[PDB]
Amino acid sequence: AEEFPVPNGFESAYREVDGVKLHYVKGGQGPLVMLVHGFGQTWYEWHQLMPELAKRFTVIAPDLPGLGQSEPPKTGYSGEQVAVYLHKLARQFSPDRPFDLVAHDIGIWNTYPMVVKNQADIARLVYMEAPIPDARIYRFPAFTAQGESLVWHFSFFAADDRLAETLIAGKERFFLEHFIKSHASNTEVFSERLLDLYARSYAKPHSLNASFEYYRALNESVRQNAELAKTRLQMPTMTLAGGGHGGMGTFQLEQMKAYAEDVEGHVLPGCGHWLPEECAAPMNRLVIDFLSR
Amino acid sequence: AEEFPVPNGFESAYREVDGVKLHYVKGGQGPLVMLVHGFGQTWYEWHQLMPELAKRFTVIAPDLPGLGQSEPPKTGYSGEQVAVYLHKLARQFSPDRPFDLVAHDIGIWNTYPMVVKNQADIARLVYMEAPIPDARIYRFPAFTAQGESLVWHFSFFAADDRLAETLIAGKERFFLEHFIKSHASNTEVFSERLLDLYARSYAKPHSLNASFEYYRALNESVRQNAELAKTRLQMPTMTLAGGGHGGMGTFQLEQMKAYAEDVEGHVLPGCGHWLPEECAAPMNRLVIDFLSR
Numbered sequence: 001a002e003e004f005p006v007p008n009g010f011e012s013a014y015r016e017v018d019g020v021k022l023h024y025v026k027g028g029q030g031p032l033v034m035l036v037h038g039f040g041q042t043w044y045e046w047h048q049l050m051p052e053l054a055k056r057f058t059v060i061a062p063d064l065p066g067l068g069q070s071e072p073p074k075t076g077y078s079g080e081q082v083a084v085y086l087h088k089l090a091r092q093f094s095p096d097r098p099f100d101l102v103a104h105d106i107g108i109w110n111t112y113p114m115v116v117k118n119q120a121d122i123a124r125l126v127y128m129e130a131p132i133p134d135a136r137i138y139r140f141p142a143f144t145a146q147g148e149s150l151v152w153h154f155s156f157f158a159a160d161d162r163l164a165e166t167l168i169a170g171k172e173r174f175f176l177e178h179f180i181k182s183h184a185s186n187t188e189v190f191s192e193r194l195l196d197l198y199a200r201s202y203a204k205p206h207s208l209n210a211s212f213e214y215y216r217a218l219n220e221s222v223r224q225n226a227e228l229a230k231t232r233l234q235m236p237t238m239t240l241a242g243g244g245h246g247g248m249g250t251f252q253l254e255q256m257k258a259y260a261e262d263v264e265g266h267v268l269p270g271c272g273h274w275l276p277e278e279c280a281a282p283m284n285r286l287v288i289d290f291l292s293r
Numbered sequence: 294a295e296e297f298p299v300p301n302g303f304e305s306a307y308r309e310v311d312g313v314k315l316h317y318v319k320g321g322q323g324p325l326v327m328l329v330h331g332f333g334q335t336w337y338e339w340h341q342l343m344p345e346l347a348k349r350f351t352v353i354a355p356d357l358p359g360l361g362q363s364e365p366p367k368t369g370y371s372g373e374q375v376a377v378y379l380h381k382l383a384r385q386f387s388p389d390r391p392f393d394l395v396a397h398d399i400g401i402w403n404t405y406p407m408v409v410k411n412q413a414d415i416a417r418l419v420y421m422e423a424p425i426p427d428a429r430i431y432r433f434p435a436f437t438a439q440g441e442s443l444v445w446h447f448s449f450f451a452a453d454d455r456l457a458e459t460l461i462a463g464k465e466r467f468f469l470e471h472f473i474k475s476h477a478s479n480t481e482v483f484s485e486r487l488l489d490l491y492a493r494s495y496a497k498p499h500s501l502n503a504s505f506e507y508y509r510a511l512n513e514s515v516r517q518n519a520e521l522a523k524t525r526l527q528m529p530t531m532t533l534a535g536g537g538h539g540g541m542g543t544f545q546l547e548q549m550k551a552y553a554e555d556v557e558g559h560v561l562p563g564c565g566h567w568l569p570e571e572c573a574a575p576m577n578r579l580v581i582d583f584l585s586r
């Protein structure tokens with residue numbers, strides 16, 4: 001059974017990595033590009049970009065441990081632990097060449113440590129719509145003059161007592177729709193069918209828990225990154241962020257400047273947090289052009 | 294019927310104020326002191342302080358509109374709107390003399406406007422454990438290096454689509470235990486028996502909704518207070534705050550200095566948000582002594 005429809009010419013498959021069965025969708029020919037999704041989603045958020053990229057690259061889009069059809073991590077959910085799985089998965093398919101990495105949302109948290117620790121393995125890097133976990137996140141406000149902030153979920157999801165699983169269970173579809181649309185500019189792209197598919201996936205009890213364990217490990221990830229960041233990133237990097245409601249605006253590039261020697265950034269007007277779906281055509285174009293250099 | 298046990302020698306009664314039936318518990322003789330509870334609780338948080346105060350004062354402890362056994366407000370939930378009900382209630386019992394006010398948590402939000410607008414009616418004032426709604430609240434962090442922040446619930450409760458009622462309905466008892474204990478230093482005072490009492494009250498559907506409407510009106514209260522605060526409070530004031538986990542610490546007094554000419558503050562070590570229950574002996578002593586001047 002597949003949680004999401006696989007594009008033509010792609011295959012849904014699994015690899016064991018350090019005793020954890022990871023799911024991915026793979027297609028194309030050429031140098032490897034790995035696309036890593038974030039919270040509330042799965043490999044499927046990349047399904048529009050994948051066929052275009054597959055004209056020039058071998059494309060792999062894994063499900064993060066515990067999410068989609070991937071088994072939970074056996075080590076832990078901190079960025080350094082999760083990044084091992086993703087790095088080793090990429091290396092199974094690109095053992096002899098560096099590969100490209102594109103990540104969205106918590107896909108950034110789960111890849112940054114393997115990028116900085118294995119720079120020779122990373123040809124080009126694209127990061128969109130999430131802070132790298134560091135002390136900057138402690139400044140985001142709990143509440144705004146316009147009401148509900150965009151970041152209060154960091155605390156909701158990190159809270160103990162399984163607070164988030166307990167309140168969201170039985171209301172997974174309701175909560176996800178609220179979360180996705182409140183972080184969107186272009187809500188129309190989230191059809192009832194698309195929301196149904198994402199909700200069914202993250203509502204699997206181990207996946208609902210996995211979702212929040214990423215946040216329960218966030219402080220540990222920040223502490224980890226405090227040490228890792230002593231080494232600057234040297235590979236060509238591009239950042240993307242939405243400039244509309246729900247988006248991160250200038251933060252993405254400005255943070256990345258502290259991490260990378262060679263970075264260019266774009267802010268996409270009229271687009272929120274969910275760039276691959278809200279603004280597929282220009283996002284796809286920018287990613288394809290940057291990687292095709 | 295009574296949701297909470299009335300102390301010996303007190304009465305539970307109701308008063309209709311501008312078309313809204315307010316519940317209160319009253320006892321004692323002498324000048325009037327009104328005690329106003331906050332979120333998650335009812336008049337009952339004051340039940341240990343009340344008999345002591347009643348030796349020197351007429352004591353009234355109302356349920357906030359919509360909470361406990363009080364009807365929802367008919368105007369709205371902004372501070373200025375709710376303060377009218379509380380001011381009129383007090384003045385029914387003390388029409389020719391000023392009265393004392395003690396308020397905790399959102400009790401502050403719901404009384405500040407009537408204090409500033411009717412300064413001659415307030416002899417002495419005690420505020421504990423909440424910010425007065427102003428722009429300072431936009432600076433509190435969504436997430437901290439220790440985990441769950443103090444005020445992330447501001448956004449949860451303010452969120453559209455009845456997000457909070459939808460998630461919390463049926464899980465009120467679970468949620469309230471988490472909320473109260475996460476904001477406490479001395480968690481041991483929150484027995485299952487006591488939590489049962491509070492949860493059964495706020496689980497009434499109109500009470501669960503009323504609770505969150507106070508937060509949905511928070512930005513309105515901030516706008517209201519920006520005008521009101523152009524006049525400083527002139528009456529003797531005391532602030533209390535917990536110095537332990539969950540407490541507001543030095544913020545309480547520091548903010549109050551901007552609002553009051555005559556203020557003394559105390560931070561109680563090893564106590565969190567729930568001062569009357571976590572640290573009954575020193576809190577009661579501070580309040581009784583201050584009002585007895």
Ligand SMILES: O=C(O)Cc1cc(I)c(Oc2ccc(O)c(I)c2)c(I)c1
Binds near residue numbers: 139273
């Ligand atoms: O602190 C700054 O410089 C500016 C800043 C402020 C915030 I609130 C913020 O959080 C967001 C915003 C959008 C979003 O979709 C998500 I998920 C989190 C970020 I990233 C940066």
Ligand SMILES: O=C(O)Cc1cc(I)c(Oc2ccc(O)c(I)c2)c(I)c1
Binds near residue numbers: 442443540
């Ligand atoms: O950042 C600052 O200025 C200091 C600050 C930080 C926070 I997070 C905060 O919110 C609280 C604190 C305790 C509490 O019990 C509740 I409910 C809310 C406050 I008030 C002040």
